[PDB]
């Protein structure tokens, strides 16, 4: 237990929370706009995972302003989560290399 780990953990928790909330809020914003395919929860969930992990298939994109704000939230949160976990891994390897040597 250090910090890079103790921050990657919080990033993971908060990402899970944002995927759930984004599913819910995306459904809540998409319903009411004719033509919206993003209007049930179980696929707002898989859409949130495909969007946060920057995959973007493109079969269930949001079509409203608030739905798109929710999408931007999910995108930024996922990018931050994974970049921060990458930083954590880098710090761990730096430590282990500052020991294979001395400094």
């Amino acid at each position: 237990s250090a910090l890079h780990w103790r921050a990657a953990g919080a990033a993971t928790v908060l990402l899970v929370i944002v995927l759930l909330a984004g599913s819910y809020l995306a459904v809540l914003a998409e319903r009411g706009a004719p033509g919206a395919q993003l209007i049930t929860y179980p696929r707002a969930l898989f859409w949130s995972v495909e969007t946060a992990t920057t995959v973007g298939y493109g079969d269930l994109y949001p079509v409203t302003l608030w739905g798109r704000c929710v999408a931007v939230v999910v995108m930024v949160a996922g990018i931050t989560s994974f970049g921060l976990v990458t930083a954590a891994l880098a710090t761990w390897f730096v430590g282990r290399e500052q020991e294979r040597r001395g400094h």
Partner: antibody
Framework: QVQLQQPGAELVKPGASVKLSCKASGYTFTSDWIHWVKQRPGHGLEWIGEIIPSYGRANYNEKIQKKATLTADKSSSTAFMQLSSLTSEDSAVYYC???????????WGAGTTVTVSS | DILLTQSPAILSVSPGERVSFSCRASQSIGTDIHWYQQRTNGSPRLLIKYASESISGIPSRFSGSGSGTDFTLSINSVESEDIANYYCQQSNRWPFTFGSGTKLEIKR
């Protein structure tokens, strides 16, 4: 058991407002939407509007007359529809259905035979 | 919106026999179609969810199939209790829509 509970009938003089009530026992999740379905005599089913109570957001059939107003109630798990100022065309059995946010109407109510006549 | 067309509106069948209602959506919607039943002065009964999935309390008599734009609701061995009106309802794009309906007649 019986979960959605609707008054049997309503009579309104042609022009007033009518406020339909639908009360739900059983489970009440936060992901429950409440839909309304107008069924004219001799016609099929026609989707009117939906509302999520655990937030209070309502959508209304933008392709037919959008006179109504769906409202919610925090505790008792009861929803209201505000069909105000009608003609004699707005006379139908009005169903409320519960949807778990997964698209299909699991449970319906008994309906409310709403009658417009002087 | 999405147009659900149900041909024909009236379908007559002799008892103990396989009737097949049909629903056709105005654009591909995958399997987001759901079959309801309603008898005279009754309320809708969810028969099938997502094209081909069962509901508790629904007999094995009722099947359900199809995907994309064409969907089918079948009944092996019709019997008098099946005399009702059958609707399809889609949940793929907003708003949800219903079908025009279809009546089951039994020639006895």
């Amino acid at each position: 058991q019986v979960q959605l509970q609707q008054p049997g009938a309503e009579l309104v003089k042609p022009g007033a407002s009518v406020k339909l009530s639908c009360k739900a026992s059983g489970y009440t999740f936060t992901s429950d939407w409440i839909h309304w379905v107008k069924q004219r005599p001799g016609h099929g089913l026609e989707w009117i509007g939906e509302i999520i109570p655990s937030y209070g957001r309502a959508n209304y059939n933008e392709k037919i007359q959008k006179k109504a107003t769906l409202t919610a109630d925090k505790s008792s798990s009861t929803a209201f529809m505000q069909l105000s100022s009608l003609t004699s065309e707005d006379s139908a059995v009005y169903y409320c259905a519960r949807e778990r946010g997964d698209g299909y109407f699991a449970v319906w109510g008994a309906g409310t035979t709403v009658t417009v006549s002087s | 919106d999405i147009l659900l067309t149900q041909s024909p509106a009236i379908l007559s069948v002799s008892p103990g026999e396989r009737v097949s209602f049909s629903c056709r959506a105005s654009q591909s919607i995958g399997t987001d179609i759901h079959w309801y039943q309603q008898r005279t002065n009754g309320s809708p009964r969810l028969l099938i969810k997502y094209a081909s999935e069962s509901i508790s309390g629904i007999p094995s008599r009722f099947s359900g199939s199809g995907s994309g734009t064409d969907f089918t609701l079948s009944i092996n061995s019709v019997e008098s209790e099946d005399i009702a009106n059958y609707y399809c309802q889609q949940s793929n794009r907003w708003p949800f829509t219903f079908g025009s309906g279809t009546k089951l007649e039994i020639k006895r």
